[PDB]
Amino acid sequence: TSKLKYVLQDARFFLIKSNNHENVSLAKAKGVWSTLPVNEKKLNLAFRSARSVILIFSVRESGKFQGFARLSSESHHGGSPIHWVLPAGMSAKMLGGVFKIDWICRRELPFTKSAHLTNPWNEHKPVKIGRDGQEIELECGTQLCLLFPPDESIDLYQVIHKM
Template sequence: MIISSNNLQALISKCWASTKDGTKKLNEAFHQCIQMKNDFPIYLFFSINKSSQFCSVAKLLSDSSYQPPSCIKWDSQDKWDGQFKLDWIFVKDIPNKYFKPLKNKLNDYQSVVHSRDVQEVSTEEGYEMLQFFQNFNQETSILDDFDEIIKIQKKLKLNK
C-alpha cells in the first residue's frame, strides 16, 4: 500500500497512525492476511507529501490496536485513528521518476506515483517497488535531517 506521510516521528517510534478511512483499509488488509494464513506480509511504501519521491518501506506488524511503549503525540491528534506497529525495511529517498513507469492494476492502471493515501498496490507492482528499493543506490534519506530527529526524540522522551 502507498502511504502519504509528512513526519519523521513514525520512523523514530516504529509506529504509524492513519485517518479513519486509512485505518479501516489497513485493518481489513491485516486481518485478511491473518485469516488467509497469507505468508506474504503487507508492505507500506511511504511517500512524503509534495516531495516527489518515496522515502521508505515498512512491514505492517499489527492492526490499529497497537499501544506503543511511549506516548506519541501526533500532529492534529484528532485526525488519526489508532496506531500500527511497523518494521522499517528500507529508508532511502527515491525520486518518483524511477517509479513512474509502474502502472497499478488496482488503481485504473495509473502510475504508482499518482496514488492516494492508503492506495493498495498489486502484488506485481509491490514486488517491483521492493526490488527497486533494494537495488537503488542511495544518495539521500529522510534520516539526513538529524536536527529534526533529535528534536522528535527529545519530545518522545518527555512524553514517557
C-alpha cells in the same frame, strides 16, 4: 534479494501519504504509524487477512518515496499517544490508533525511477499517483519495492521471525 523477496511473498501493498516529513521521520524513529479512520479500518482488515501488509511511504509533494515497512500489529488504542506533527485542520483524534511497523527499507526512491511502473488497481496510472491508502497490485508493488536501494543497517531478522 532472498530475504526481501520472502518478506514480500503474497503481500498486500498500500501507498501511505504524509503531509509532512516530520511524521515519517518519527515513524522511522519509533516504528509506528497512524492514519485516518477509513484507512485505519482498511489496514486492520488487511492485516488480519493477508500474509504481510507492506506500507510504501511518500511525503506529499516531495517527488519521492521515503521507504517501506511491514505492519506488525493492528492499530492500538488507549496507550501513550504519539506526538505527531498535526497538519493544519487535522486533530490528534483523527489519527486514531497506532500501528506497530517494522521498517524494511528507510532509503529514498525518486519518482523518476518508478515512472515505468503502472498500478492496474489505480486506472493504470504510474504507481507514484495515489491518495493515502491507495492499494497497489501485487506485481507492481513487488517490483516497486525491489527498486529501492539496499538499507545496509536494517536487520530483517525481527520481521522474518514474526512471520
